Every structure is written in C-alpha cells, then in structure tokens.
C-alpha cells in the first residue's frame, strides 16, 4: 500500500509494520479484530 | 486522471522530554498514566475544523514536516503506522479512522479530560474519557524504540498539559499500578516542552537552521556489566587495609567511632575495626569485589605489572591528626599511594573500571526485581553526583599501582 | 526507492510554564495543495 | 435510509416544522473522501424552506431530525439522492453522499 516507506538493507518479514485493532461492547466481549499492515507479501524461501 | 487541488490548513505536534521503552535491563514498569485539560471553543475558525488529537508515537515518526503530507497536507498524529492517537470519536492508525462508543459520544470539547493508558506486557493502549472507559484497544505492536506523549492542534489552541507530581493535579485516580510519568526523566537536566524534528527556530538575529539531533535507543537504555602470578593474590589485605584506611577517614568527620549497635541515624558504625576483629562478611567485602576486579583487570586491557619493589615497605602512612584514635586502635592512616599521577589510559581505565562497578551493581539490583522497588540508571547515563564519588573511592584502590 | 527528495520551506510558520504548562497558539495559517490521485501524496 | 450520526451536541428541544425556514452551514462530501460542495468557502449560509421540495429528499429528512445548534453527519444512500443520471459534472452516477450539516439559527 502507498503508505510504506521502510528503506533498509536488513529487512526481514519480522520488520513489517502490522497493527491489530480490536473493538468490543461495554461488556468487554469483542466485536471485531482488524489488522492493518503496510505490506502484504510472502517469502520465496518458504517454498524452496 | 487529472490533478485536483484545494486549500489545506496547518498542524503541529508537541511532546515532552520523557522517554519510556521496554528492553532487557532497566525498563521501569511498563505502566504509565496522564491526563490533559482543553478549553478551546473554536470549531470552524478559518473554514475547516480544528484538528485536536492526543496519543502515543514511537521514536521514528518524522511526521511533522510542515507543509505537504500523504492524504491531505502535513497532518498530525494517527495518520501512519508510527503513531497511535484519539480524537474524541475515532481511532486513527494508517490514515484511516473508525468510530468509537462511549457515554456522551462527543469529540473533544472545552472543559474535558481524556486519560490514556500504557501496559507493555500485553502491550496494548487504551483510552478513557473524563470518567468512563473508551471501548477500544490497540494490540499487536512491534515495540522496538521508545514512545512520545504526542498532541495535535491546528491553531488558536491554549491546551494545558497534565503530568502529575511535579505540578499536574490528577483529577482522577489512576488504575492500580501506574507511574505518574514525572519520575521518568533524563537525570542530567530538567524537563520542558519542545517541538519534534524542528529544523527552524527563532533567535535574536532571527531564524536558526538546525540539523538532525541525537536520540537514545532500546540497546542504549540497558546496563551491561563487563564480562596466576603469586603477587597478584599475595597483596590482598595489603591493598584492602590500604583501602580500609579511608573507611574511617571521613567517618571521623562523621563521628562514627565504632558504634557497637550500628547507629544508622545517631552517628555510629559497627564495622570500624581491624579485619579479624571485623564481623564474618567483612573480609571478602573488601577483597572479593577487589580480587575479582584485579582478576577482571586483565580483561580491562591495562598495561600493569607488579615490579616496583622499592624497599617493599617505602609506602608510608599519613597519621597523627590529633587524637584520631578509637577503642580498636586503628587510627586510620592511608599509605603513600599519593604521589602516583597515573597514565592517560589510567584516567579512563579507572573510569572504565568505575563504569563496570556501577554496571555490575546495576545487574545485582536488577536481579532482585529491579531492587524490589521500595533509583540507579546505567553508567554514562546517570547523574553527575554519582559520577564523582565512584572515581575517588576506586582511585585509592587503583593508586596501589607502581607501589607493589 | 531513493531516500531523498527536495521539499520547499514555507515562508511563515505557526509562531508559538505556569499552572498546567499550557501551550500558546493564536493565529491561523493555511496553504494550497495538490492531490495527484494515482498514489496519493499531497 | 438516512443515517444521522451526531458530532456536537445541541439544544434538543427546538426542531424544524413545516413551512419554516432553516439556515444550514453544510459541507458535503462523497464516500471516497472527496469534497464536492461546501457552504463555508463562500461564507454564505444555505437557507431553505422545509416541505416545499427545494433540497433533495435526503437533505430535508436529514435536517428535520436535528435540533437547534446541533451538528451531525449524514450518509445519504444513492436511492434517495440522484439515483440514475445524477448531477452532471459534480457527482458521478450511483454515488453515496455524505453531509456534515449544522443548523445555525431559526429551528
């Protein structure tokens, strides 16, 4: 997505921004659990 | 297809000097709390609404950049993945907002209080309206640096910012276990409000262009303690007694002449006698931390070798300042380790050894649950007063160079 | 990706202790902007 | 369907009736976030008569549910405002309209 500006030479998939947003009721029981990430990729080393 | 255009107002962010983070070492508690006071009544001055937000941001923001931005203009907190904030009706992360629920359902208004939360084991951020919880929590972080209490404002704003024990009158009671955030300050200066990533500042001549500043990191805020010839183990007490001479020197000025009951407040001391006359944990008290220090001294990289042997007894003591004598008969008298002006490396080697001593004791304090609560920071980051005593105390032990 | 650009310096900024350590801000300020929609800077 | 979500509280007792003028200092937006109308760039508040079919259907069924001094946020569905052909040059066809209405005075 366009709001991604990580320019590093030591990048691994652990170095990916990911923020989990959860909301619930006043009872405390959750109501959704959204995860926004600035990057949606896989690792090619995870297949070969 | 085309290039649309419009008018955008301006916004700026302000943060305190405090710096909180979590890492292996001195990491405080991971439980912090503060409020804030707002009394602004200008919702539509100069067309667009007046942006007002508060929250957290990590120490890689670089957001301010007054002018252009990403969505529309150089916006404030919440429109990225490096800042988490709240406005009164929405949660902002990644420039996208979601509505929240609470009793009252109105955004920030004059005469109101908002309470933020911090808990770095779950790690998650919650918020609290003046007297009720806000139903929403951020989770799944990537905490690697530190955090800023950040505020956002467009213009025409006179917000008062609440801290705590210093002057912030906490209207409400923090939940069980939360530092008021005034304790966490750099122990080398006072606290103040400054704008983040400022590159122009006013002055008597006028504008001043300032480049990038410096900042700490997770690794920096972590103390780290450092990792046989017969004469090395032969001296022992000889250096210990020479160190033990000073143990009464200023404790004569204190007036603590061998207190038999350990008067901690009425000026007496129970370990002010000879080594054998001393209690059981008093010989390694001045030798174990010194023998290991000498054992570690090889790892210090110093160039030392016991080869003086000047009559093997020319190190004469200094004594006879009036009575100066106790029931024990010690009459403390430091030896002739006075005319030793050290070496350029020794000026730092003693400091380097002193840094190890502060770091080693820091690890010992950290082991017992960070001193088990109830005030010492990592070396080279600590205060100035602590940097004074530790030099002279270790110097006398180190002045034995070229004497034995 | 290249970690450099050339951004302009606005000619006027936002300008700006006691109980509460309040902030000071009176005057408003604004600017004109573009919204090239392909990738969305401004 | 008009979803009225409030933004700032109001009086809560004075509501518009038939045959009565209102002044509304609105600013309209689309679903994507692009503004297509504002009545504050002109510094001239919009005034309309309720019931005589001046405004669109979503605007008056939106302005009737509010109070004096209240500022709310509407989400007008495309069925009730410019369904098929739309308004040429401003609003694309089959687009959702969002209005941040604020009633200044006179119900």
Coordinates of C-alpha atoms in Angstrom, one line a residue:
Chain A
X1 CA 0.0 0.0 0.0
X2 CA 1.2 3.6 -0.7
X3 CA 1.9 4.5 3.0
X4 CA 5.0 2.3 3.2
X5 CA 8.5 3.9 3.5
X6 CA 10.8 1.4 5.0
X7 CA 14.2 1.6 3.2
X8 CA 16.6 -0.7 5.0
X9 CA 19.1 -3.3 3.9
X10 CA 18.4 -5.6 6.9
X11 CA 14.7 -6.2 6.0
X12 CA 13.1 -9.5 7.0
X13 CA 9.4 -10.3 7.4
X14 CA 9.6 -9.6 11.1
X15 CA 10.4 -6.0 10.1
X16 CA 6.9 -5.3 8.8
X17 CA 4.5 -2.9 10.4
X18 CA 1.3 -4.5 11.5
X19 CA -1.2 -3.0 13.9
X20 CA -4.2 -5.0 15.2
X21 CA -7.3 -3.0 16.0
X22 CA -10.0 -4.7 18.2
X23 CA -13.3 -3.2 19.4
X24 CA -15.9 -4.6 21.7
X25 CA -19.0 -3.7 23.7
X26 CA -19.3 -2.2 27.1
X27 CA -19.5 -5.8 28.4
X28 CA -15.9 -6.3 27.1
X29 CA -16.8 -9.0 24.7
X30 CA -15.1 -8.2 21.4
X31 CA -16.8 -7.2 18.3
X32 CA -14.2 -7.2 15.5
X33 CA -10.4 -7.7 15.2
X34 CA -8.9 -5.8 12.3
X35 CA -5.3 -6.0 11.3
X36 CA -3.8 -3.2 9.1
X37 CA -0.4 -3.8 7.6
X38 CA 1.6 -1.6 5.3
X39 CA 2.8 -4.7 3.4
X40 CA 1.3 -8.0 2.2
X41 CA 4.0 -10.4 1.0
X42 CA 5.3 -13.9 1.3
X43 CA 8.8 -15.3 1.5
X44 CA 10.1 -17.1 -1.5
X45 CA 12.5 -19.0 0.8
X46 CA 9.4 -20.6 2.4
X47 CA 8.9 -22.8 -0.6
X48 CA 12.4 -23.8 -1.8
Chain B
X1 CA -6.9 11.3 -14.1
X2 CA -6.4 15.0 -13.6
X3 CA -4.6 16.8 -10.8
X4 CA -7.1 18.1 -8.3
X5 CA -6.3 20.9 -5.9
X6 CA -7.7 22.6 -2.8
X7 CA -6.7 24.5 0.4
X8 CA -5.3 22.8 3.5
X9 CA -4.6 24.3 6.9
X10 CA -1.6 23.6 9.1
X11 CA -1.0 21.4 12.2
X12 CA 1.9 20.9 14.6
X13 CA 2.8 18.3 17.3
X14 CA 4.3 18.8 20.7
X15 CA 5.8 16.2 23.1
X16 CA 7.6 16.3 26.5
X17 CA 11.1 15.2 27.2
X18 CA 10.1 11.9 28.8
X19 CA 11.3 8.7 27.1
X20 CA 9.8 5.3 28.0
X21 CA 10.7 1.9 26.5
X22 CA 10.9 -1.8 27.2
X23 CA 14.0 -3.9 26.9
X24 CA 16.2 -6.3 28.8
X25 CA 17.5 -4.1 31.6
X26 CA 16.2 -1.0 33.3
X27 CA 12.7 -0.8 31.8
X28 CA 10.7 0.8 34.7
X29 CA 7.3 -0.9 35.0
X30 CA 5.5 -0.5 31.6
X31 CA 2.6 1.2 33.3
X32 CA 2.1 4.9 32.8
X33 CA -0.8 7.4 33.1
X34 CA -1.6 11.0 32.4
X35 CA -4.5 13.4 31.6
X36 CA -4.9 16.8 29.9
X37 CA -7.0 19.9 30.0
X38 CA -8.7 21.5 27.0
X39 CA -10.6 24.8 26.9
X40 CA -10.9 25.7 23.2
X41 CA -14.1 26.9 21.7
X42 CA -13.1 27.4 18.0
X43 CA -14.6 24.6 15.9
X44 CA -14.8 26.3 12.5
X45 CA -12.3 29.2 12.6
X46 CA -10.9 29.6 9.1
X47 CA -13.2 27.2 7.3
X48 CA -12.0 23.7 8.1
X49 CA -12.4 22.1 11.5
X50 CA -9.8 22.5 14.2
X51 CA -7.8 19.3 14.5
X52 CA -7.2 18.1 18.0
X53 CA -5.7 14.7 18.9
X54 CA -3.6 13.0 21.7
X55 CA -1.8 9.7 21.9
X56 CA 1.4 7.8 21.5
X57 CA 4.1 7.7 18.8
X58 CA 7.4 5.8 18.6
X59 CA 10.8 7.3 18.1
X60 CA 10.9 7.1 14.3
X61 CA 8.0 9.4 13.5
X62 CA 9.5 12.2 11.3
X63 CA 5.8 13.2 10.7
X64 CA 5.8 17.0 11.4
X65 CA 7.3 18.1 8.0
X66 CA 5.2 21.4 8.0
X67 CA 3.5 21.6 4.6
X68 CA 2.7 18.7 2.3
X69 CA 1.8 15.2 3.5
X70 CA 0.2 12.0 2.3
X71 CA -3.5 12.2 2.4
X72 CA -4.1 16.0 2.6
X73 CA -1.2 18.1 3.9
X74 CA 1.3 17.6 6.6
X75 CA -1.2 16.1 9.1
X76 CA -0.5 15.2 12.7
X77 CA -0.8 12.1 14.9
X78 CA -2.7 9.0 13.9
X79 CA -2.2 9.0 10.1
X80 CA 0.6 6.5 9.9
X81 CA 1.8 3.2 11.5
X82 CA 4.3 5.0 13.8
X83 CA 1.7 6.9 15.9
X84 CA -1.5 5.9 17.7
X85 CA -4.0 8.6 18.8
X86 CA -7.5 9.5 19.6
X87 CA -9.7 12.5 18.7
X88 CA -12.9 12.0 20.7
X89 CA -15.0 9.9 18.3
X90 CA -12.4 8.0 16.2
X91 CA -9.3 5.9 16.4
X92 CA -6.6 6.7 13.8
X93 CA -4.0 4.3 12.6
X94 CA -2.7 4.3 9.0
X95 CA -4.7 7.4 8.0
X96 CA -8.0 5.5 8.3
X97 CA -10.4 6.2 11.1
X98 CA -13.0 4.0 12.9
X99 CA -15.8 5.3 15.2
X100 CA -15.8 4.5 18.9
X101 CA -18.5 4.3 21.5
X102 CA -18.8 5.9 24.9
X103 CA -21.3 7.7 27.1
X104 CA -21.6 11.2 25.7
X105 CA -20.5 10.5 22.1
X106 CA -19.0 13.9 21.5
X107 CA -15.5 14.7 20.3
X108 CA -13.0 16.9 22.3
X109 CA -14.8 19.9 23.7
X110 CA -13.8 22.7 26.2
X111 CA -13.7 21.7 29.8
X112 CA -13.0 18.0 29.3
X113 CA -10.4 15.3 30.4
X114 CA -9.0 12.3 28.5
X115 CA -7.0 9.6 30.1
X116 CA -4.5 7.4 28.2
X117 CA -3.1 4.0 29.2
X118 CA 0.1 2.1 28.7
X119 CA 0.9 -1.5 29.6
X120 CA 3.9 -3.2 27.9
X121 CA 3.3 -6.8 28.7
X122 CA 0.0 -7.3 26.9
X123 CA 1.3 -4.4 25.2
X124 CA -1.8 -2.6 24.3
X125 CA -3.1 1.0 24.5
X126 CA -6.4 2.0 26.0
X127 CA -8.1 5.4 26.5
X128 CA -10.5 6.8 29.0
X129 CA -12.9 9.7 28.6
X130 CA -13.3 12.1 31.6
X131 CA -14.9 9.4 33.9
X132 CA -15.7 6.4 31.7
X133 CA -13.8 3.9 29.6
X134 CA -13.5 4.1 25.9
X135 CA -14.4 0.8 24.3
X136 CA -11.4 0.1 22.1
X137 CA -7.8 -1.1 22.5
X138 CA -4.9 -1.3 20.1
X139 CA -2.9 -4.6 20.0
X140 CA -0.2 -6.5 18.1
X141 CA 2.6 -4.0 18.3
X142 CA 6.2 -4.1 17.2
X143 CA 7.8 -2.2 20.0
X144 CA 11.5 -1.6 19.2
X145 CA 12.3 2.0 20.3
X146 CA 10.6 4.4 22.8
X147 CA 7.4 6.4 23.0
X148 CA 6.2 10.1 23.0
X149 CA 3.2 11.6 24.6
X150 CA 2.0 13.5 21.5
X151 CA -0.6 16.2 20.9
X152 CA -2.0 17.6 17.7
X153 CA -3.5 21.1 17.2
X154 CA -4.4 23.3 14.2
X155 CA -4.5 26.8 15.5
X156 CA -5.9 29.0 18.2
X157 CA -5.3 26.5 21.0
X158 CA -4.3 27.0 24.6
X159 CA -4.3 23.4 26.0
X160 CA -2.9 22.8 29.4
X161 CA -0.9 19.6 29.6
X162 CA -1.1 17.4 32.8
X163 CA 1.8 15.4 34.1
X164 CA 1.4 14.7 37.9
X165 CA 3.6 15.0 41.0
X166 CA 5.6 17.9 39.6
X167 CA 2.6 20.2 39.2
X168 CA -0.1 18.1 37.4
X169 CA -3.1 17.9 39.7
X170 CA -4.5 14.5 38.8
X171 CA -8.3 15.0 38.9
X172 CA -8.9 11.2 38.9
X173 CA -7.3 8.2 40.5
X174 CA -5.0 6.1 38.2
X175 CA -5.9 2.4 38.0
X176 CA -3.9 0.0 40.2
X177 CA -0.3 0.4 39.3
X178 CA 0.8 3.3 37.0
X179 CA 3.7 5.7 37.4
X180 CA 2.7 9.4 37.1
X181 CA 5.4 9.7 34.4
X182 CA 7.2 12.5 36.2
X183 CA 9.7 10.0 37.6
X184 CA 11.0 9.1 34.1
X185 CA 13.2 12.0 33.1
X186 CA 16.8 12.1 31.9
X187 CA 18.7 12.5 35.1
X188 CA 21.0 15.2 33.6
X189 CA 18.7 18.2 33.1
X190 CA 15.2 19.5 33.6
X191 CA 12.0 18.7 31.7
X192 CA 10.4 21.0 29.1
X193 CA 8.2 21.1 26.0
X194 CA 9.8 21.1 22.6
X195 CA 8.6 20.5 19.1
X196 CA 9.7 17.3 17.5
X197 CA 12.0 17.3 14.4
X198 CA 12.3 21.1 14.4
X199 CA 14.6 22.5 11.7
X200 CA 14.0 26.2 12.1
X201 CA 13.9 28.2 15.4
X202 CA 13.7 31.8 16.3
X203 CA 16.5 33.9 17.8
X204 CA 17.9 37.4 18.3
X205 CA 19.2 37.5 14.7
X206 CA 16.1 35.6 13.7
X207 CA 15.8 32.2 12.0
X208 CA 18.2 29.5 13.0
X209 CA 18.7 26.4 10.8
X210 CA 19.3 23.3 12.9
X211 CA 20.1 19.9 11.6
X212 CA 19.2 16.4 12.9
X213 CA 19.5 15.9 16.6
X214 CA 20.5 12.8 18.6
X215 CA 18.4 10.3 20.4
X216 CA 18.7 7.2 22.6
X217 CA 17.6 3.6 21.6
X218 CA 16.5 0.3 23.2
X219 CA 20.0 -1.0 23.4
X220 CA 21.3 2.2 25.0
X221 CA 18.8 2.1 27.8
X222 CA 20.2 -1.2 29.1
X223 CA 23.0 -1.6 31.6
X224 CA 25.6 -4.2 30.8
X225 CA 28.2 -5.4 33.3
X226 CA 31.6 -6.2 31.8
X227 CA 32.5 -9.8 31.0
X228 CA 48.0 -16.5 38.2
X229 CA 51.1 -14.7 39.4
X230 CA 51.7 -15.1 43.1
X231 CA 52.0 -11.3 43.8
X232 CA 48.5 -10.7 42.3
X233 CA 47.0 -12.9 45.1
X234 CA 49.7 -12.1 47.6
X235 CA 48.8 -8.4 48.3
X236 CA 45.1 -8.9 49.0
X237 CA 44.8 -7.5 52.6
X238 CA 47.7 -5.1 52.0
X239 CA 45.6 -3.3 49.4
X240 CA 42.4 -4.0 51.3
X241 CA 43.9 -2.4 54.5
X242 CA 45.1 0.5 52.4
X243 CA 41.6 0.8 51.1
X244 CA 40.3 0.1 54.7
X245 CA 42.3 3.1 56.0
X246 CA 39.8 5.5 54.3
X247 CA 36.8 3.7 55.8
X248 CA 37.1 5.8 58.9
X249 CA 38.8 8.9 57.3
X250 CA 35.7 10.9 56.7
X251 CA 33.8 8.7 59.2
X252 CA 35.9 10.5 61.7
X253 CA 34.4 13.7 60.3
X254 CA 31.0 11.9 60.6
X255 CA 31.9 11.0 64.2
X256 CA 31.1 7.3 63.9
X257 CA 33.7 5.8 66.3
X258 CA 32.9 2.0 66.2
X259 CA 29.3 2.1 67.2
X260 CA 28.6 -1.3 68.7
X261 CA 24.9 -1.3 67.8
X262 CA 25.0 0.1 64.2
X263 CA 23.5 3.5 64.7
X264 CA 22.2 4.2 61.3
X265 CA 20.9 7.7 62.3
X266 CA 22.6 8.7 65.5
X267 CA 26.1 8.7 64.0
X268 CA 27.9 5.4 64.8
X269 CA 29.2 2.5 62.8
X270 CA 29.7 -1.3 63.6
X271 CA 32.4 -2.3 61.1
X272 CA 35.1 0.2 62.0
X273 CA 37.8 -2.2 63.3
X274 CA 40.5 -4.5 62.1
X275 CA 39.8 -7.3 59.6
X276 CA 40.0 -10.1 62.1
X277 CA 38.1 -8.0 64.6
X278 CA 35.6 -7.3 61.9
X279 CA 32.4 -9.5 61.6
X280 CA 32.2 -12.5 59.3
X281 CA 31.2 -10.8 56.0
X282 CA 33.8 -8.1 56.1
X283 CA 37.0 -9.7 54.6
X284 CA 35.6 -10.6 51.2
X285 CA 33.5 -7.4 51.5
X286 CA 36.8 -5.5 50.6
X287 CA 38.6 -8.3 48.8
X288 CA 36.1 -10.4 46.8
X289 CA 34.9 -7.4 44.8
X290 CA 38.5 -6.3 44.6
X291 CA 40.2 -9.7 43.9
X292 CA 37.7 -10.3 41.1
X293 CA 38.3 -6.7 40.0
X294 CA 42.0 -7.5 39.7
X295 CA 41.2 -10.8 38.1
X296 CA 39.0 -8.9 35.6
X297 CA 41.6 -6.2 35.3
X298 CA 43.5 -8.3 32.8
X299 CA 40.4 -8.2 30.6
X300 CA 40.5 -4.4 31.0
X301 CA 43.4 -4.3 28.6
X302 CA 45.6 -2.3 31.0
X303 CA 49.4 -2.5 31.0
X304 CA 50.2 -3.3 34.6
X305 CA 52.9 -5.4 36.2
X306 CA 53.9 -5.5 39.9
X307 CA 57.6 -4.7 39.7
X308 CA 58.2 -1.6 41.9
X309 CA 59.6 -3.3 45.0
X310 CA 61.0 -0.1 46.3
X311 CA 62.4 -1.5 49.6
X312 CA 59.0 -3.3 49.7
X313 CA 58.0 -1.0 52.6
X314 CA 58.6 2.5 51.5
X315 CA 54.8 3.1 51.2
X316 CA 54.5 5.1 54.4
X317 CA 51.2 6.1 56.0
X318 CA 49.9 9.5 57.0
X319 CA 48.6 9.8 60.5
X320 CA 48.5 11.8 63.8
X321 CA 45.7 14.3 63.2
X322 CA 45.2 15.0 66.9
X323 CA 43.7 12.2 69.0
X324 CA 42.0 10.4 66.0
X325 CA 42.2 7.1 67.9
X326 CA 39.4 4.7 68.7
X327 CA 38.7 1.8 71.1
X328 CA 40.0 -0.6 68.4
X329 CA 43.4 1.2 67.9
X330 CA 43.0 1.6 64.2
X331 CA 43.8 5.3 64.0
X332 CA 43.3 5.2 60.2
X333 CA 46.4 6.2 58.2
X334 CA 46.3 5.9 54.4
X335 CA 49.7 4.8 52.9
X336 CA 51.9 6.6 50.4
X337 CA 49.6 5.9 47.3
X338 CA 49.5 9.7 46.9
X339 CA 52.4 10.5 44.5
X340 CA 51.1 8.4 41.7
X341 CA 49.8 10.6 38.8
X342 CA 48.6 7.7 36.7
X343 CA 48.6 7.5 32.9
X344 CA 46.4 8.9 30.1
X345 CA 44.8 5.5 29.8
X346 CA 44.5 5.2 33.6
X347 CA 42.5 8.4 33.7
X348 CA 39.9 6.4 31.7
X349 CA 40.8 2.9 32.9
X350 CA 39.8 3.9 36.4
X351 CA 36.6 5.4 35.0
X352 CA 36.1 2.3 32.8
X353 CA 36.6 0.1 36.0
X354 CA 34.2 2.5 37.8
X355 CA 31.7 2.0 34.9
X356 CA 32.0 -1.8 35.4
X357 CA 31.3 -1.3 39.2
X358 CA 28.2 0.7 38.5
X359 CA 27.1 -1.8 35.9
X360 CA 27.8 -4.8 38.0
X361 CA 25.8 -3.4 40.9
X362 CA 23.1 -2.5 38.5
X363 CA 22.8 -6.1 37.4
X364 CA 22.7 -7.2 41.1
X365 CA 19.9 -4.6 41.8
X366 CA 18.0 -5.7 38.7
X367 CA 18.2 -9.3 39.7
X368 CA 16.1 -8.7 42.9
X369 CA 13.2 -7.4 40.8
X370 CA 14.9 -4.1 39.9
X371 CA 15.9 -3.5 43.6
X372 CA 12.3 -4.6 44.5
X373 CA 11.1 -1.0 44.2
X374 CA 10.9 0.4 47.7
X375 CA 16.9 4.6 41.7
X376 CA 20.1 4.0 39.7
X377 CA 20.4 4.2 35.9
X378 CA 23.0 2.8 33.5
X379 CA 26.6 4.1 33.6
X380 CA 27.4 7.2 31.4
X381 CA 23.7 8.0 31.5
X382 CA 23.4 8.5 35.3
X383 CA 23.6 11.8 37.2
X384 CA 26.7 13.9 37.9
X385 CA 26.9 13.5 41.7
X386 CA 27.2 9.7 41.4
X387 CA 30.0 10.2 38.8
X388 CA 32.0 12.0 41.5
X389 CA 32.1 9.6 44.5
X390 CA 32.8 6.4 42.4
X391 CA 36.1 7.9 41.0
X392 CA 37.8 8.7 44.3
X393 CA 36.7 5.5 46.0
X394 CA 38.1 3.3 43.3
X395 CA 41.2 5.5 42.8
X396 CA 42.6 4.7 46.2
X397 CA 42.4 1.0 45.3
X398 CA 43.9 1.8 41.9
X399 CA 46.6 4.1 43.3
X400 CA 48.5 0.9 44.5
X401 CA 50.0 0.8 41.0
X402 CA 53.8 1.3 41.0
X403 CA 53.7 0.7 44.8
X404 CA 53.7 -3.1 44.9
Chain C
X1 CA 13.4 3.7 -3.7
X2 CA 15.8 6.6 -3.0
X3 CA 15.9 8.1 0.5
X4 CA 16.0 11.8 -0.7
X5 CA 13.7 14.4 -2.1
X6 CA 13.5 18.2 -2.4
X7 CA 10.8 19.9 -0.3
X8 CA 10.2 23.6 0.0
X9 CA 10.4 25.8 3.1
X10 CA 7.3 27.7 3.9
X11 CA 7.9 31.5 4.5
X12 CA 5.7 31.6 7.6
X13 CA 5.3 29.1 10.5
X14 CA 2.8 28.7 13.4
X15 CA 4.8 31.1 15.6
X16 CA 4.2 29.7 19.2
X17 CA 5.4 27.4 32.4
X18 CA 2.6 28.4 34.8
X19 CA 0.0 26.1 36.3
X20 CA -0.5 23.2 33.8
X21 CA 2.3 24.3 31.4
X22 CA -0.1 25.5 28.8
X23 CA 0.7 25.9 25.1
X24 CA 0.4 29.1 23.2
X25 CA -1.3 29.5 19.8
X26 CA -3.5 32.3 18.4
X27 CA -3.0 33.0 14.7
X28 CA -4.3 30.7 11.9
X29 CA -2.4 29.7 8.8
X30 CA -3.1 27.8 5.6
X31 CA -1.6 26.7 2.3
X32 CA -2.6 25.4 -1.2
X33 CA -2.1 21.8 -2.1
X34 CA -2.3 19.2 -4.9
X35 CA -3.7 15.6 -4.7
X36 CA -2.3 13.6 -7.6
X37 CA -4.6 10.6 -7.2
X38 CA -2.5 7.7 -8.7
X39 CA -0.5 7.0 -5.5
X40 CA -1.9 9.9 -3.3
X41 CA 0.7 12.2 -1.9
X42 CA -0.3 15.8 -1.3
Chain D
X1 CA -32.3 5.4 4.6
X2 CA -30.6 8.4 6.2
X3 CA -28.0 7.6 8.9
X4 CA -27.8 10.6 11.3
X5 CA -24.6 10.4 13.4
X6 CA -24.1 13.3 15.7
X7 CA -20.9 15.2 16.0
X8 CA -21.5 18.0 18.5
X9 CA -24.5 18.3 21.0
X10 CA -27.2 20.8 20.6
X11 CA -30.3 22.2 22.4
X12 CA -32.6 19.2 22.0
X13 CA -35.9 20.9 22.2
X14 CA -36.2 23.1 19.1
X15 CA -36.9 21.1 15.9
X16 CA -38.0 22.3 12.4
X17 CA -41.6 22.2 11.5
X18 CA -43.5 22.7 8.1
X19 CA -43.4 25.9 6.2
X20 CA -40.5 27.3 8.3
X21 CA -37.1 28.4 7.0
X22 CA -33.8 27.0 8.2
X23 CA -30.2 28.2 7.8
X24 CA -27.7 25.3 7.4
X25 CA -24.0 25.9 7.0
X26 CA -23.3 22.5 5.5
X27 CA -20.3 20.9 3.7
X28 CA -20.9 17.9 1.6
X29 CA -18.6 15.0 0.7
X30 CA -18.6 11.8 -1.2
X31 CA -17.9 8.3 0.2
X32 CA -14.3 8.2 -1.1
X33 CA -13.4 11.4 0.8
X34 CA -13.6 14.0 -2.0
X35 CA -15.4 17.2 -1.2
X36 CA -17.9 18.3 -3.8
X37 CA -19.7 21.2 -2.0
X38 CA -19.1 23.5 0.9
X39 CA -21.1 26.5 2.1
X40 CA -18.3 27.9 4.2
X41 CA -15.8 28.6 1.4
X42 CA -18.4 31.2 0.2
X43 CA -19.1 32.5 3.7
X44 CA -22.8 32.5 2.9
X45 CA -25.0 30.1 4.8
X46 CA -27.5 27.9 2.9
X47 CA -31.2 28.8 3.6
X48 CA -34.0 26.5 2.5
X49 CA -37.8 26.1 3.2
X50 CA -38.8 22.7 4.6
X51 CA -41.5 20.8 2.8
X52 CA -41.6 22.8 -0.5
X53 CA -39.2 20.3 -2.2
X54 CA -36.3 22.7 -2.7
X55 CA -33.5 20.4 -1.5
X56 CA -33.1 16.7 -2.2
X57 CA -35.1 14.2 -0.2
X58 CA -32.2 13.1 1.8
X59 CA -31.3 16.6 2.9
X60 CA -34.7 17.5 4.4
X61 CA -35.4 14.2 6.0
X62 CA -31.9 14.7 7.4
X63 CA -32.4 18.3 8.6
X64 CA -35.8 17.5 10.2
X65 CA -34.3 15.1 12.8
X66 CA -31.9 17.6 14.3
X67 CA -32.1 20.3 16.9
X68 CA -31.1 24.0 17.0
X69 CA -27.3 24.3 17.3
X70 CA -26.7 20.6 16.6
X71 CA -24.1 19.5 14.1
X72 CA -24.5 15.9 12.7
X73 CA -23.1 13.8 9.9
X74 CA -25.4 12.2 7.4
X75 CA -24.8 9.3 5.0
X76 CA -27.4 9.7 2.2
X77 CA -28.0 6.5 0.2
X78 CA -27.9 6.9 -3.6
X79 CA -31.5 5.8 -3.9
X80 CA -32.8 9.0 -2.2
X81 CA -30.4 11.5 -3.8
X82 CA -29.5 11.4 -7.5
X83 CA -30.1 7.8 -8.4
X84 CA -29.7 7.2 -12.1
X85 CA -28.5 10.2 -14.1
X86 CA -27.1 12.3 -11.2
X87 CA -25.9 15.8 -11.5
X88 CA -23.6 16.1 -14.5
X89 CA -20.1 17.5 -13.8
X90 CA -20.2 17.2 -9.9
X91 CA -21.4 13.9 -8.7
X92 CA -20.9 10.6 -10.5
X93 CA -23.9 8.4 -11.0
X94 CA -24.7 5.8 -8.2
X95 CA -22.5 7.5 -5.6
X96 CA -23.1 7.8 -1.9
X97 CA -23.4 11.4 -0.5
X98 CA -22.1 12.4 3.0
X99 CA -23.2 15.7 4.6
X100 CA -21.9 17.5 7.7
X101 CA -24.9 19.7 8.4
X102 CA -25.0 22.3 11.1
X103 CA -28.2 24.2 11.9
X104 CA -27.2 27.8 12.9
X105 CA -30.5 29.5 13.8
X106 CA -34.3 29.6 13.4
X107 CA -35.2 25.9 14.1

